[PDB]
Amino acid sequence: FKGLDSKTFLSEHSMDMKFTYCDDRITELIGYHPEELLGRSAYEFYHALDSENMTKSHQNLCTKGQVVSGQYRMLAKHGGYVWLETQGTVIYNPPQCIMCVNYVLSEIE
């Protein structure tokens, strides 16, 4: 059994969805080292069956400014998938970046 903080991690993305920062907690949970994620779009990692739903959730984030993703799968580093729910927030300036608070719903499947 894991405590809430240990299943949560933050990530930051450019408006093109590429990772620009990820907390080190992701490593224990999904296998990735943060620096290997950098410069790759979120889209590289969604299961095929979640892809279209994520595109619609992204539109909503861009029109509303904040969105909760609802349940999706991230490809894990050594294959299989982990279920996540994310709260996304756009940071706008003087859009600049997207901040994601990511909560793991499952082990690697």
Binding site: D16, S41, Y43, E44, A48, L49, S51, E52, L75, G79
Partner: protein, 110 residues
């Protein structure tokens, strides 16, 4: 009976910078659904590194054709086998960075 195919241009990173409207019949997406995205985003997880390595090599091959087969996720969320044939173009009157031209055909894996 024609194969179903469409042309695209990419930057050296893999991002679609041009997409021929024959894509709608080939894979189901409007060109604007592909433009600005990296081709690897449409690629099966088992094939994504081969596709990244292929974009990386085609620029070393002196403008000659490099082919790759990979599973592409159609607009219906289904994996379609694609054979992408790619080569670089650089206009010798200039020193602008080369880009990659691809022809993308749905093929059988058998």
């Amino acid at each position: 009976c024609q194969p179903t195919r469409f042309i695209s241009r990419h930057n050296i990173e893999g991002i679609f910078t041009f997409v021929d409207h024959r894509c709608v019949a080939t894979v189901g997406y409007q060109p604007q659904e592909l433009l600005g995205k990296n081709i690897v985003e449409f690629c099966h997880p088992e094939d994504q590194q081969l596709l990244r390595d292929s974009f990386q090599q085609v620029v070393k091959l002196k403008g000659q054709v490099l082919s790759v087969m990979f599973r592409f996720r159609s607009k219906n969320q289904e994996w379609l086998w694609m054979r992408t044939s790619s080569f670089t173009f650089q206009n010798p009157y200039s020193d602008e960075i080369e880009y990659i031209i691809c022809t993308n055909t749905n093929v059988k894996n058998s």
